[PDB]
Design a protein around this ligand. Structure first.
Ligand SMILES: Nc1nc2c(ncn2[C@@H]2O[C@H](COP(=O)(O)OP(=O)(O)NP(=O)(O)O)[C@@H](O)[C@H]2O)c(=O)[nH]1
Ligand SMILES: [Cl-]
Ligand SMILES: [Mg+2]
Lengths: 996, 17, 206, 131
């Protein structure tokens, strides 16, 4: 279109045209906006646009155009400043400084173009980072001087200094080299005495609110690093905690400053310092009570109303109080005259903790945890806080969340502490709360759920006798509450809360068998209830109680004729008749927990056989039927039956582990034959219908059978104790059933769960089956690698499981890679490096660990032909491939492990652990050390990959890096320094002497 | 006996009017 | 009544997917990096009337950054996004916040930890505290499962309108029209393809 | 004595059927299905005309992702990858304003709910045939 004219640099820049593009972008819409956007990005990215920046800044009337001009200048200053002729550098500085002065002198511009002035201030700071103080020693003196001639200039100078402090102390770690950061930190520290004087004078004298606020904003940044004497040996704390807490325009920033003061490095000896720390807290709290709101105010209501900046203020007040009191409350706990202050501050926190705001509640709760833990352990403290703690009990009980998971655990911990501190008070609050559920004054589904969670959360805190009375009272009252209510909906809610509380008090259940049996039988009744959620609740409570009370199901209880587990198995068909499949499996898993408590082998195996009677009979039947007619496996009903049988076995094996072997032996051979039959059917369907067959319900049901078979074998082998049987009985039939099927299926039909199953086998018994591991590699390695080496996205599960398998083979049976033919071992190396390049952490991490373990495996072989050829063939491949991901800015998540691998590789040469020349006889003179050749290779590699670096930069980087290859922390710092320098031109090569 | 009273009551727990 | 919203965060955190979900209801599974910025109007119906967000969906990858902080000018609200399965994206939250509030000095800002649907979470809930001192609202979200996906806009709407009781409400449902034998074969063709293209995510609950 | 005290467009329809579902639209130029919304799918019978439509809204935002007459010409057909979904052509849906034509797929939590939807869908087609 027409707007593209600004991209033609042969002609002069038409500013009026620039603004039509800029206005169209910022104020336009639709297609026009999108076009101007692409034009502006192209204009901005022109490496010569900076030359046209002073034109835009001088003659444009559009603030956005001048902003973009400064962004263009920013790119130049931060990346290519040092390549410029010195004249341009002086010129650029001059017309940035001059522009800032002019904008500050025009009051209309100063107040209406804040964004543009702030951008100019940051651009100035970028120049200071390049030039100051070595080429600009008068900046700070001249800044302080200019401040006196104009309130506007003085206010803006506070903005510049704020940004300078941020760039030097807050955001330098990853953006500057260590040496440059230290240089600028020292320079600011050298001249801060003058800076502080100006800042204090402004605060003590100034009357312009905007100037005061800017000065306080800069002070907030200083408090991150300045020595404490500037705060405690001046009168600044008085000003902050009194004057500036009264006016709302300075209140927010002042409170943030005082929060950071509460974190300064302060001597713990001086009693006058402690007095000053007490004093500014006293002053702040007094100003809050007189100028903002009294202690009694309803902060919950104020926050909910959301007037003005009330929400941010209450957030900041919570941060101030919690920060100060976590560090300094002991200062207030001994002196009688400070007791009211201590308790008023905690009362504000009580009121803040009633606010309905999740993230703010977590902030106050973190503090309460700190307090009640100290009251639990510290002598002679808990009595000070009795009234605070009593209120807190109610707050936490009334805001209990659903057992969100982290928040519940935090709430439980505080409430447990609070219960120990006063068990009587806790119990009375909870019983009262329950009364107000029964009398209806506070009744609701939410309120009864919350109270039940709180009651259940303190299990274990009371004596068993007190707990007995308490549990009986709560359950009686809850039982009456359920009878009282009408409608399934209300009764279901209460009945579920009853079961929740019961399941939280296993000590009670263990001591009262007759009650425990009644509970279980009631849960079995609820398993026939169709009301939404009841059956899930009944099964979840059942397995939860079993996990804790299993012993009382496996013994024969007094007055009973058999262990209750027998009774459960006798009626299992009736009990579960109405459950969905997932719920039946939970039931069987719970039975397996109990059965594994029986350590009589013959009794345990008998219980196991009886539990599995129904699935085993269903299994025997459709092993006969399925065999006589493989068509059945196309019947969705038979497929679903089979999958649920296997899922039942998985559930029981999950809880019984090693004890499951007799049941596995009952089905194992017929199960693997089924795996083959299913496999043939899947292949036949894909052949008859195409790859789309894998999406059909029929094939998905068939593949579920295969996946559950693999999961069952996985589950048992991962828990097996007799590994001789795993090797002699299980592995060979397994590999024969799964490996060829995987290799010879088309990619879209290969189950990634095969790889996962093989990983478990290798992990558990890999050391005992070296020929089996070779067979695994032969069947899955090349064909899986070909699935995943064309892009980083296809076959995501195979990708992850593939490198998990290679990793465990490399750990447990490294000899299998030694048997690979040279061509396949080369693919192995390619596969490892390919993993480096993934952004997917589930692949990149394993790729780097395999590489590290492989180098270690090679090193362990000593001076032998395979190790020597490995270094000759692959050492520099790994060095260069690791360097590539380290420096390409697209794998920052792997930096730590990339650095470790690189340091290991370099240390091999540094320690002469490689016995052959890494070079060829013709490359370098005879006798050249691998050390020298490594440095030459790396120097040449970096020169071609980063041609804008000087030879001196590269040599100094490599000298430091190799010297530091036994010091990972320092090694990583030098790598980070290199990553900074490659982003710019003219980096200082002495930076790499920082550690030395 | 207080546990036995409560247990008897628990045995009649029900969710339908 | 329209408000400019700037959406920032590391590349790959789900910013574009999140907006797309709100615009069309779809979940885009492919990662196609945003180049510079994409602007999309987004309207919500509330008990205070419609509210329109002009969403500036910016690029998180540095090599595609475009005008970078130039996009933030005159923004009235913002969402900072990171990925709870990638620690580096949370480590960079202070950097995005820094660049944002230097241009937009007092706007409501939501911090969003996306991808909570993924089991292997890497940025733990207890580690996420940056919003506290910066007065940002925080939400766990998932553009995939839609967990909390409306909360960022609901909170911003309440701040921008100044009404803490604002609620999303059901847009009016106009009566639909009623119902060309010349296109009976053109639609049966598009239908034959549609039937033979498997629906995605067949294991999801819906 | 007298004390003065302190000072959607679905309302006129009947709900024949309601079910949670996920709605898809087919993008024929990308050859892939795209989700349009998840929420309650309702068959709404107008009390004045006795005509039935499908009205579906997304959870939380409550934005309309389907609004069209259950025309008696439409035909539900299965999708190759699902036993709990139906594919059918729609020639006038006004969820996003201007009446467009779509190839929709709607999926349910179970084959059972999908079969019920089919039943109700065809019953509603009969309702609309008479009116
Ligand atoms: N599992 C999961 N994946 C998600 C979620 N949100 C987005 N993704 C995926 O993350 C990848 C990147 O999504 P995208 O929206 O492009 O991220 P972006 O922040 O816009 N990247 P850029 O800054 O380069 O434009 C996509 O593959 C997307 O499907 C989520 O909530 N859960
Ligand atoms: Cl036990
Ligand atoms: Mg994007």
């Amino acid at each position: 279109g027409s707007m593209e004219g600004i991209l033609d640099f042969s002609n002069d820049l038409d500013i009026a045209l620039l603004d039509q593009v800029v206005s169209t972008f910022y104020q336009g819409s639709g297609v026009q906006q999108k076009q101007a956007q692409e034009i502006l990005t192209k204009f901005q990215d022109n490496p010569d646009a900076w030359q046209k920046a002073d034109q835009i800044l001088q003659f444009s009337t559009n603030p956005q155009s001048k902003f973009i001009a400064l962004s263009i200048l920013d790119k130049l200053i931060t990346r290519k400043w040092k390549l410029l002729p010195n004249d341009h550098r002086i010129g650029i500085r001059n017309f940035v400084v001059g522009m800032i002065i002019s904008m500050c002198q025009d009051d209309e511009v100063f107040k209406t173009q804040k964004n543009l002035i702030n951008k100019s201030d940051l651009t100035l700071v970028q120049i200071l980072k390049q030039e100051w103080p070595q080429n600009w020693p008068e900046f700070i003196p001249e800044l302080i001087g200019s401040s006196s001639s104009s309130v506007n200039v003085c206010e803006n100078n506070m903005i510049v200094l704020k940004l300078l402090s941020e760039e030097v102390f807050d955001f330098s770690a990853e953006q500057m080299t260590q040496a440059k950061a230290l240089h600028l930190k020292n320079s600011m520290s050298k001249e801060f005495e003058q800076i502080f004087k100006l800042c204090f004078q402004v605060l003590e004298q100034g009357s312009s609110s905007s100037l005061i606020v800017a000065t306080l904003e800069s002070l907030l940044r200083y408090l991150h690093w300045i020595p404490y004497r500037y705060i405690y040996e001046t009168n600044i704390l008085e000003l902050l905690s009194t004057k500036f807490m009264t006016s709302p325009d300075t209140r927010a920033i002042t409170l943030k400053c005082l929060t950071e003061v509460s974190n300064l490095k302060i001597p713990q000896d001086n009693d006058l310092i402690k007095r000053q720390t007490v004093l500014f807290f006293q002053n702040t709290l007094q100003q809050i009570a007189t100028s903002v709101m009294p202690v009694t105010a309803d902060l919950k209501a104020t926050y909910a109303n959301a007037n003005g900046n009330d929400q941010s203020f209450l957030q900041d007040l919570a941060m101030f109080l919690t920060t100060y009191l976590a560090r300094n409350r002991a200062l207030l706990e001994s002196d009688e005259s400070l007791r009211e202050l201590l308790l008023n501050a905690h009362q504000y926190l009580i009121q803040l903790s009633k606010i309905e705001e999740r993230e703010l509640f977590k902030t106050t709760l973190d503090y309460w945890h700190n307090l009640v833990a100290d009251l639990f352990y510290e002598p002679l403290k808990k009595h000070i806080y009795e009234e605070i703690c009593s209120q807190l009990r109610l707050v936490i009980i009334e805001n209990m969340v659903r057992p969100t998971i982290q928040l519940y655990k935090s709430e439980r911990e505080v409430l447990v502490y609070l219960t120990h501190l006063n068990v009587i008070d806790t119990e009375e609050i909870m019983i009262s709360k329950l009364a107000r559920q029964i009398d209806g004054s506070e009744w609701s589904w939410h309120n009864i759920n919350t109270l039940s969670w709180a009651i259940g959360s303190i299990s274990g805190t009371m004596s068993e006798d007190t707990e007995k009375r308490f549990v009986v009272t709560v359950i009686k009252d809850l039982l009456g509450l359920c009878e009282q209510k009408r409608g399934k909906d209300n009764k279901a809610v209460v009945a579920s809360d009853i079961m929740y509380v019961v399941g939280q008090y296993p000590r009670f259940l263990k001591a009262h068998w007759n009650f425990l049996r009644t509970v279980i039988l009631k849960l079995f009744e609820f398993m026939h209830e169709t009301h939404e959620g009841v059956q899930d609740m009944a099964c979840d409570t059942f397995i939860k109680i079993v996990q804790k009370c299993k012993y009382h199901f496996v013994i024969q209880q007094p007055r009973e004729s058999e262990p209750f587990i027998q009774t459960i198995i006798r009626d299992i068909q009736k009990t579960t008749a109405d459950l969905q499949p997932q719920q039946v499996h939970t039931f069987y898993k719970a039975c397996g927990i109990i059965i594994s408590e029986e350590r009589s082998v013959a009794e345990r195996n008998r219980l196991l056989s009886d539990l599995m009677q129904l699935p085993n009979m269903a299994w025997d039947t459709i092993v006969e039927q399925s065999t006589a007619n493989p068509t059945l496996l196309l019947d969705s009903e038979t497929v679903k039956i089979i999958a649920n049988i296997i899922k039942t076995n998985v559930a029981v094996c999950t809880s019984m582990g090693a004890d499951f072997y007799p049941q596995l032996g009952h089905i194992y051979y017929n199960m693997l034959q089924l795996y083959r039959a299913v496999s043939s059917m899947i292949s036949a369907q894909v052949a008859a219908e195409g790859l789309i067959a894998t999406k059909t319900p029929k094939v998905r049901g068939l593949r579920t059978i295969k996946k559950e078979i693999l999961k069952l074998v996985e589950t048992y082998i991962s828990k097996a104790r007799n590994l001789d049987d795993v090797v002699k009985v299980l592995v060979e039939p397994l590999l024969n059933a799964v490996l060829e099927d995987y290799m010879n299926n088309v990619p879209d039909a290969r189950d990634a769960e095969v790889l996962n199953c093989m990983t478990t086998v290798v992990e558990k018994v890999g050391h005992m089956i070296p020929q089996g591991v070779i067979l695994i590699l032969q069947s899955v390695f090349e064909c899986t690698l070909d699935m995943i080496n064309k892009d980083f996205t296809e076959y995501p599960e195979h990708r992850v499981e593939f490198y998990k398998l290679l990793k465990v083979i490399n750990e447990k049976s490294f000899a299998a890679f030694l048997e690979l033919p040279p061509a396949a071992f080369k693919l192995f190396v390619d596969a490892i490096c390919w993993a480096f390049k993934h952004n997917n952490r589930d692949v990149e991490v394993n790729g780097l660990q395999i590489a590290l373990d492989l180098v270690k495996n090679i090193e362990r072989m000593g001076n032998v032909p395979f190790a020597n050829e490995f270094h000759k063939n692959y050492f520099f491949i790994f060095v260069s491939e690791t360097f590539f991901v380290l420096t390409d800015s697209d794998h920052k998540s792997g930096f730590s492990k990339q650095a470790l691998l690189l340091m290991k590789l370099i240390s091999l040469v540094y320690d002469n652990k490689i016995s052959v020349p890494l070079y060829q006889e013709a490359e370098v003179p005879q006798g050249t050390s691998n050390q020298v050749y490594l440095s030459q290779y790396l120097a040449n590699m970096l020169s071609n990959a980063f041609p804008h670096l000087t030879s001196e930069q590269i040599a100094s980087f490599l000298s430091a890096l190799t010297k530091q290859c036994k010091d990972l922390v320092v090694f990583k710092g030098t790598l980070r320094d290199f990553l900074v320098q490659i982003k710019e031109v003219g980096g200082d090569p002495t930076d790499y002497l920082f550690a030395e | 006996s207080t546990v036995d009273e409560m247990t008897k009551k628990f045995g009649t727990l029900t969710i339908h009017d | 009544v329209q408000f400019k919203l700037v959406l920032v965060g590391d590349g790959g955190t789900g910013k574009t997917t999140f907006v797309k979900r709100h615009l069309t209801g779809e979940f885009e599974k492919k990662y196609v990096a945003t180049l510079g910025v994409e602007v999309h109007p987004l309207v919500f119906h509330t008990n205070r009337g419609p509210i329109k967000f002009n969403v500036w969906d910016t690029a998180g990858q540095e090599k595609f950054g475009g005008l970078r902080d130039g996009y933030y000018i005159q923004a009235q609200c913002a969402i900072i996004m990171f990925d709870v399965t990638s620690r580096v994206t949370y480590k960079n939250v202070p950097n995005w916040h820094r660049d944002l509030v230097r241009v937009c000095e007092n706007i409501p800002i939501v911090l969003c930890g996306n991808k909570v649907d993924i089991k292997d979470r890497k940025v733990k809930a207890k580690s996420i505290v940056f919003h506290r001192k910066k007065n940002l609202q925080y939400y766990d979200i998932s553009a995939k499962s839609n967990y909390n996906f409306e909360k960022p806009f609901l909170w911003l709407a309440r701040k921008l309108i100044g009404d803490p009781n604002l609620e999303f409400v059901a847009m009016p449902a106009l009566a639909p029209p009623e119902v060309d034998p010349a296109l009976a074969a053109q639609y049966e063709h598009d239908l034959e393809v549609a039937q033979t293209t498997a629906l995605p995510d067949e294991d999801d609950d819906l | 004595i007298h004390f003065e005290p302190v000072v959607t467009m679905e309302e006129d329809e009947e709900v024949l059927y309601k079910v949670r579902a996920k709605l898809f639209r087919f993008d024929a130029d990308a050859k892939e299905w795209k989700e349009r919304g998840t929420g309650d799918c309702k068959f709404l019978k107008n009390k004045k005309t006795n005509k039935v439509r499908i009205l579906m809204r997304r959870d939380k935002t409550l934005k309309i992702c389907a609004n069209h007459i259950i025309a008696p010409e439409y035909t539900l057909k299965p999708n190759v990858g699902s036993d709990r979904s139906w594919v059918y052509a729609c020639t006038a849906d006004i969820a996003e304003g201007e009446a467009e034509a779509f190839t929709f797929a709607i999926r349910f939590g179970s084959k059972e709910n999908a079969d019920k939807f089919k039943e109700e869908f065809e019953k509603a087609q009969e309702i609309n045939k008479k009116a």
